[PDB]
Amino acid sequence: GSPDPRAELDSTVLLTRSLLADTRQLAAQLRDKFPADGDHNLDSLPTLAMSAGALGALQLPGVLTRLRADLLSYLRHVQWLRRAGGSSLKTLEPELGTLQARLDRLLRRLQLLMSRLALPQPPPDPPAPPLAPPSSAWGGIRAAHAILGGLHLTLDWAVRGLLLLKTRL
Ligand SMILES: [Cl-]
């Protein structure tokens, strides 16, 4: 029947925490084999907003819309890594593909949450062009660090933001 938004956010946060843990584990596996010297970034990745000062009902549609968009970008990047990241990263399977499938599940859950709560849906956006292949094997490894680290941060701020917002529902 009418969903309880608090319970729905609780459920969504639990699944986000699961994906956060998977992402953290894969990032540490990657650093064990290919250590990183510096925080790595990629221009094609979303800029994370890190909103959590004061969040309430008015902000919920926007937070969820932005999360959906960000997670879809991370999915594109994860798929790109698996296909074109270079042989150096074949060792990250099958875990990277499992992460991809779980990200898909969370994306489905977010669209359903928005539908059941009758929240305004984003306009069908123009899909981003293909990602260029890495310019080198080490460039591909740095991109993997950037992708897993950025996904981790996105999921951490989603957990934080959604739980804070829930306190005002
Ligand atoms: Cl399920």
Side-chain angles (χ1 to χ4, degrees), residues 3 8 17 19 30 34 36-38 42 50 53-54 56-57 61 72 77 85 88 102 106 111 117 120-121 142 145 157:
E8 294 298 330
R17 289 194 192 273
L19 192 62
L30 177 60
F34 300 101
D37 204 327
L42 280 182
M50 288 205 185
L72 181 64
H77 279 79
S88 295
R102 288 166 184 180
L106 179 59
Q111 185 164 280
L117 292 169
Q121 295 277 354
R142 293 182 185 173
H145 287 295
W157 280 90

Side-chain angles (χ1 to χ4, degrees), residues 17-86:
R17 289 194 192 273
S18 293
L19 192 62
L20 183 172
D22 290 337
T23 303
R24 171 173 69 210
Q25 289 177 238
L26 197 47
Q29 172 181 337
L30 177 60
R31 283 191 303 267
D32 182 50
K33 307 317 187 183
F34 300 101
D37 204 327
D39 196 60
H40 296 296
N41 293 280
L42 280 182
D43 291 338
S44 50
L45 286 172
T47 299
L48 176 63
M50 288 205 185
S51 51
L55 289 182
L58 195 64
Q59 285 75 48
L60 176 67
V63 169
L64 293 181
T65 294
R66 195 145 48 252
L67 185 57
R68 287 172 61 186
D70 287 0
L71 290 179
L72 181 64
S73 183
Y74 277 98
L75 186 140
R76 284 175 207 269
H77 279 79
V78 168
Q79 177 168 75
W80 170 81
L81 274 177
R82 298 175 62 214
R83 299 192 323 94

